[PDB]
């Protein structure tokens, strides 16, 4: 029933419009804003703990918006609460990564961080260039597809509503909603990207999105070894809860 597909699509697009940390309008105005050399130096001078704490806050900030995104999606809130929790815990960062592509400049490889765009050298103090490089390469590759806001909305929702997450009690229900989302997205893609493979190319990036996020979890686990106190007493409570 196209009627249902359309309503589901509109609801997700509406939710996305109302729940990104940065609206398209704000992004357009923040377009030409890269950190100054002094600001970049400042970032590189921060301790590893200090920068990690800053990164943890920014990520948590973005994750909180993904939670709002999910709550405004009718089909999501119809899933039993247990699965809602599982989808969010396993997919919040993946959605943030997809959304991050909206705030990534593929010409000079810079990402919006704390109000301005900065290259990967901005994260030097993390001592995790492999993680950063992987995050940037994905963003750069997703940006090459030139997705519209509607496509990003629908795709980010498909990433979130994944019937493959382990421990789901009612996977089939998640699968059913995700199929309606993918079918909606496939049609939207026709409006833009003439000559595609686009949906298939997007779907093929799913495992990559997950690899970047697992790498994040790994880098974090080691950080917890070196600085346990900073994690349990300084990082945002939600960040600790989701990745510990």
């Amino acid at each position: 029933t196209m009627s249902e597909i359309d309503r589901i699509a509109q609801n997700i697009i509406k939710s996305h419009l109302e729940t990104c940390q940065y609206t398209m309008e704000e992004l357009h105005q923040l377009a030409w804003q890269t950190h100054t050399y002094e600001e970049i130096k400042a970032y590189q001078s921060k301790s590893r703990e200090a920068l990690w704490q800053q990164c943890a806050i920014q990520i948590t900030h973005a994750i909180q918006y993904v939670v709002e995104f999910a709550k405004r999606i009718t089909g999501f809130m119809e899933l039993c609460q247990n699965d809602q929790i599982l989808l969010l815990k396993s997919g919040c960062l993946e959605v943030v990564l997809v959304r991050m592509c909206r705030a990534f400049n593929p010409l000079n490889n810079t990402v919006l961080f704390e109000g301005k765009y900065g290259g990967m050298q901005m994260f030097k103090a993390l001592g995790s260039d492999d993680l950063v490089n992987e995050a940037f390469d994905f963003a750069k590759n997703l940006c090459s597809l030139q997705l519209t806001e509607e496509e990003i909305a629908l795709f980010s929702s498909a990433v979130l509503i994944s019937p493959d997450r382990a421990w789901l009690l009612e996977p089939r229900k998640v699968q059913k909603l995700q199929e309606k989302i993918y079918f909606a997205l496939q049609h939207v893609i026709q409006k833009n990207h003439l000559d595609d493979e686009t949906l298939a190319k997007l779907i093929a990036k799913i495992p990559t999105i997950t690899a970047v996020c697992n790498l994040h979890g790994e880098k974090l686990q080691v950080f917890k070894q070196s600085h346990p106190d900073i994690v349990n007493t300084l990082f945002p409570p939600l960040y600790k809860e989701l990745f510990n």
Binding site: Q64, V67, A70, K71, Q81, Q84, I85, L88, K89, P237, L238, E241, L242
Partner: peptide
Amino acid sequence: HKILHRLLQE
């Protein structure tokens, strides 16, 4: 997941 649980119901 006390926190995530709280946010979902806020």
